[model samples]
Target chain A: XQFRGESVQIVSGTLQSIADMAEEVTELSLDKRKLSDSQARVSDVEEQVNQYLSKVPELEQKQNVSELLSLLSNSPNISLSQLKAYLEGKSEEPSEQFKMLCGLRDALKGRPELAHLSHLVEQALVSMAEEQGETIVLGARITPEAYRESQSGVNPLQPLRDTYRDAVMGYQGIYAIWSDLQKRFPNGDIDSVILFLQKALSADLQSQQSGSGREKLGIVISDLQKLKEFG
Target chain B: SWIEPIISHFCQDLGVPTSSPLSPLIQLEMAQSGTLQLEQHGATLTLWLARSLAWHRCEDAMVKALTLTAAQKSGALPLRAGWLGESQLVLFVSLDERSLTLPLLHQAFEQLLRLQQEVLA
Candidate 1:
C-alpha cells in the first residue's frame, strides 16, 4: 500500500510534467508564428522543438520504470528527494530496482547531444525583448496574470488556445521523432535522432499550408505524413 | 497571433502598457563575451549566446535545443523583479529547453547592443 502511494505520486508528477511541457510547447508554437517574415530560421527552431517533443516518451518511460522499481524495492521511507539523490551519483552497493530506476532516469536525461540548446533559446528571447525595449529578468515564471498584463485588448481564449496548441504540437513532434528513431535505430543514437527530427520538421513546414486546423498538433500530424512520404 | 494578442489584452486589463520601460532600479551590462545581464528589482537576468539564437528563431527551437543538450547543462528562462514596483516590465524565463530559454537572455543583451548601435548610428 505504501509503495502504491509512492508510485502514484511519482507517476502523477511525471504526467504533470509531460502535460506542462506539452502546454508550453503549444504556447511556444503560437509565439513561433509571430516571428517576422525576415526571421524565417526554421531549421534550428524546428530542431529545438523536436528536442522538447522527444522528452515526453522518455519521461513516460521513466515514470513506468519508477513504478516498477517502487514495487521491487518497496521502500516507504525513500523520499522523492532521496530517490532522486540516490539516482544522481554512483553507488557501489545499489539495489537491483534502485539501479534500474537510476539508470532509466539518467539515460533519459543524458540522451540527445544538443546540451547548448537551452542557453540559445534564453539568449534569443532576452535579445528580442531588449530590442523591443524591455527589461531582462532571470528565472522568471509566467503567471496567468503576468501574461495578461503583457498583452492588452486581446481575447483571453487566444493564449489558452496557443498554450494547448503548443502542448499538442510538442507531443506530436516528439512522438513522431521517437517513432521514427525507434523504427530506424531501436537502441537510439543522438545524432541520428536529431537527423530524424530535422527531417520531420522540414517536411511539416513544407506542407504547412494544407493543414485544416491552425493548431500546432494538427500541423504536426500533417508534417508527419509528409515525412513518411519523403522516405 | 494567439499569445501576443492575449498578452496584450491582459496588459490592457492590468492597466500596464506592453511597451513600458524596465525599472530604473534595474541595471543592464555585458556579463560575458556573448552574454548580458539586466539587474532589475531584486532579480538578475542572464543571457548566453547559444540559447539566445534559438529564442530569436522561436520558442520551439529553444526547447528543442535545450532538450537535446540536456546532457551537458540545464537551461533557465528570464528573471523577474517586484510585481508592484514602479517598473512595468514583464519578464519571462523557462528552463525546459536550453535553446529557447537561453536566447531570451541573449535577446535582453541584444537590447543593450541596439542601444550601443543607436549611439553609433
Candidate 2:
C-alpha cells in the first residue's frame, strides 16, 4: 500500500506466481504423454485380459505357446511359466481374460486362418480355465473390475472429460469478477490498479517487442513511487 | 491433402489476428518438433505425426494409452483422438489459442521425448 486507506495490492509476487503456474502446466506435458502412451498399452493389455477371462482354459492348454507369446505385449519372449510368474507377481493384479480376444483382433483383416487361430486360442484358454476350480464370464464382473484398476490408471474418459469440461467453471467465473473490478474502480488509484496494469503490460510486451508506449502508465507508476516517499 | 476427408470439419479460424503468449518460442520448437500442430485434434486434441500415406503398424493398446493420457493432460480441448493415425504414436492437447505460452509448448516437446524413452527403455 503506497498510500493510506489502500490496504491491498497484487504485486510482482502475484505475477510471478501466475507465470509459475503457466510454466508448471507445461512442465507436466511429458508426464501427460507418458501417461497416454501407457494408457494405450494398459488398455490394450487389459482388453486382451478381458477376452482371456471370457475364454481362459483353452489359452492355457494350447500346444504351441508361440502365438500366445505374441499376446504378452511387453514380454513376448518370456516362457509361458515365467509369463505366469509375472501375472502372479508384477502383472497378476488385474490381467487374465483381457489377454484372450486381443491377438485375434490383430490378425490380418481378410484371413480366415488367423481368425480360426484366434478362435482356437480362445477356446483352448477357456477350456483350461474351468473344470471346477477356475471360472470365466463373457464380459462381466472380472473384466469391468479390471478396467477399474489404477496406478497406470484407466477409467471411462467420460468422467475426466466432465471434470475438465468446465476448464474451470470456477475459472471462467473469475473473469466475470475481473470485469467487475474494472467497473468498480474505473478512475481511482486503487491499491491493485498498478499491479493490474503492469500485468497487462507484461503480457503485452512479452509478445511483440514494440508497441504503443504507455506514457500515462509511466505517470501512474511515478505517482505511486512518489506517494510512497511522501508517506 | 492427407486430411482431405475430415479437413473440412477442421475449420481453422483465419484472419482473426491470433496470438499465443508462447508463439515466439513454440513456433521455433515446432519447426523441428511435430508432436503438436495448431488444429491438431486429440484424444481430446489427438495428434498423429506420421505421413498420411505412411504405414501405421500400431496396435490397439498403443492407441488407447495415448488417447487416455492426451485427455488427462491440462489445456485439453474437445479433440477427437480418432483423427490421428500414423506409424508414429502421437501426443496431443488444446486450449485457448491466445495467451498460450512457449514454456507450455516446451513441455509438449518434453512429453514427446518421454514417450520415445518409454519405447526404447
Candidate 3:
C-alpha cells in the first residue's frame, strides 16, 4: 500500500517532467510554427502530451491509491513481482497503471464472493458519504482474494492492504474538508453531516471490534481527527 | 482482551499444565471461539467469532503465537535464540511448504516486523 503511494509519486514526478519538456517545446515552437507545418505538428503533439501529462497529478490527488492496492492484493492477472517492480519505480509510462487496473478488473470479473465483499465495502463507503450529507464519489474496484490465490501469488496481498488503507484514510480526509466547508457555510446542514460521519465511523469501529477483528478503533478515531485538523 | 481469557479457559478445559508456553497458546484460541481449528498445519489458527473482533495486543499475539506454535506443532524441536530487532526472538525452524500455510507464512514475517512496534509501545 505504501508502495502505491511511492509509485504514484514517482509516476507523477515523471509525468510532470514530461509536461515541463512539452511546455518548453511548445513555447519554442510558437516562433517556428510559421516556417514549416511540421513545427505546427510538433507543437500540437507537445500540447497534447502536456495535456495528458497534467492528468497525472490530478489522478494522483483524486484516486485513492490505497483502495486500488487493496484491489490488487486480490487480483490474479498482475503478479506481486510486477506490482513490486512498479512500486520500486520500474516503469515511467502512465499507461502502466491503467494496464494494471484493467488486469485487476479482468481478474475480478464473475467472482461473486469478492464482488459481494467489495460491494459491501463500497456500500459502506457510500453510506458514510451520505451520512455526511455528501453525494457519493465512486472509485475503481480491484480483484478478490480467492481469485488472487488461484493465480498462485500472481498478485500480492500487501499492495492491496496498502491501497485500501489509503482509500479509507483519503475518505477520512475528505470528511474533514466537508466539515470545514459546512462550518464556512453556517446555513448549511454541516452539523448533520458531521454527526453522520461520526455515527458511521462508530458503527464501523464496533463492527470491526466484535469478532477476530484487530483493535484499530483508536487509530480510526485519531485518523478522523487528523483529517479534520488538516482540513 | 478476548485472547488472554480465552486461552486461560481453553487450558483449563484441556487440563494442560499452565506452566508450558503451549498451554497458553491453545487456551488463547479456546477463550475466543471455544475451539480452535488449525488452518495451515497448525501454522495458522482460526477462531470463529460471533462478530469481527478487535484487540490490538491480541491480534499481535495471535500472529506471533501462530508462528511459534506452528514450528513446535510440526514436531520441530525448539531452539533457544537471542532477540533480533527490538523484542523479536528469532529461532531456526525448518523451512518447508508443508510445514506452514502461505497465509501463516506471510503473517509470520509480517508479525516479526509488527512485534518491534509492540516493543516500542
Candidate 4:
C-alpha cells in the first residue's frame, strides 16, 4: 500500500489546487483595489482605441484577406498560362485574364466577389514562379522582421517543458509519485515519465478507495488524459 | 447576433461608448496596456492580441506544439495560438455560453496579457 499513500497525496493536492483556483477567481471579482485599478486601466482604453483606429488599415486588410480566402475556399486548381508566361519572364504583358482581373479589381473597388478571383491569380503567379526556380516574396509580411527575429532563439518545446514542470514539480501533493517515477527512470524524457505516472494511476485506481476519493482520482485521470494528447 | 448583448454589456461595464455596440468583433485595450480584439465565430470566441509574439508565419508544426503547451498552461480560459493571416500571434479560446462570463473574459484578457509579457520579457 506504499503507492496508496502517494495516491492519496496526489488526490489531496489536486483538490487543493482546484479550491485555490476557485478562491483566486472569486478574489479577482471582489477585490476592490484591483477592481478600481482594472477599471482605471480600462478607462484609458478609449484613447488607445482611438490610436488603434489610426492603425486600422492593416486590421481591415487582415479581415479582407480572411474573408476573401474563405469565399471560394474549396475548388480544385487550374493554373493559368498567362501567369506562367509572366513568371517565366517570356512576356512583356501580363495575361489577358490577369489584366481583366485587375480591371475588375479597379471597377468594383469595394466589392468582394472579385477578391477570390484575384487570390487565384496571385496563387498562379506563385506556382509558376516556384516552378521556374524563383523564390517568391509575394508581398510584405504582416509582422516586421525585427520583431519576429527576436523570437528566433525560442525553443518551440519550452511550453511543454514548463507544463511538465508545473504539473509534476510545482505541486507537492504528487511529490511522492514524481519522486518515485524519477528514481525509477532517471533519464526518461518528460513524456515517458508522465505516461508512467498515468499508467500507475490506472493501476492504483483498481486497488480501491472511497467513493469521493475515486471521483477525485477520476478527475486527475481525465486531466492526465488531456496532457497525453500533446505527447 | 446572439453575442451582441454580451458584448454590449461588457463594453458598458468597461465604460466604453456603445454607439457601435452590435458588431461581432470588439476591439479594446487591455488594462495592462495592449490591444485585444475579441471576436466570436459560431461557438468559439477568439481573443487576439495585437502584439507580435513571434514571426507572423512560423512553422505550422511549431505553432501547433506551442498552442498545445499553452492550452495546458492556461488558467480560467483555454489559450491557443494561431496566426491572423501572417499578421501576428493570436491567443484564442472557445467557451460555451455557460462559461462565458464577463469576469472570465476580463481574466482571460489579463491572462493573455501576462503570457505576452512573459514571452516578450
Interface RMSD of each: 21.9, 18.7, 24.2, 21.3
TM-scores of the candidates are 0.15, 0.20, 0.16, 0.29
Worst 10 residues of 3 chain A by lDDT: A4-13
Model 2 per-residue lDDT tens digits across residues A170-196: 223334434433454445333343243
Residue runs of model 1 more than 4 Å from their true location after superposition: A1-97, A106-231, B1-82, B85-121
Write the number of the candidate with greater lDDT, choosing between 1 and 4: 4
Please write out the lDDT profile of model 2 over residues B9-111, one tens digit for every residue: 2211111122222221111112222323333322222222211213443565365545445545423333223234234444444443443344543344345
A best-first ranking of the candidates according to their lDDT comes to 4, 3, 2, 1
Winner on TM-score (2 vs 3)? 2
DockQ of 4: 0.01
Candidates arranged by TM-score, highest first = 4, 2, 3, 1
Instruction: Please list the residue runs of candidate 4 whose C-alpha ends up more than 4 Å from where it truly belongs after superposition.
Output: A1-231, B29-34, B53-68, B85-87
**How many steric clashes between backbone atoms does each model show?**
82, 44, 18, 0
Interface RMSD of candidate 1, in Å, is 21.9
Winner of 1 and 3 under TM-score:
3
| DockQ value of candidate 1 | 0.01
Number of the top-ranking candidate, with TM-score as the measure? 4
Better of 3 and 4 by TM-score: 4
- How displaced is residue A127 in candidate 3, in Å? 27
TM-score (chain B) for candidate 3 is 0.24
The Cα error of candidate 1 at residue A10, in Å, is 53
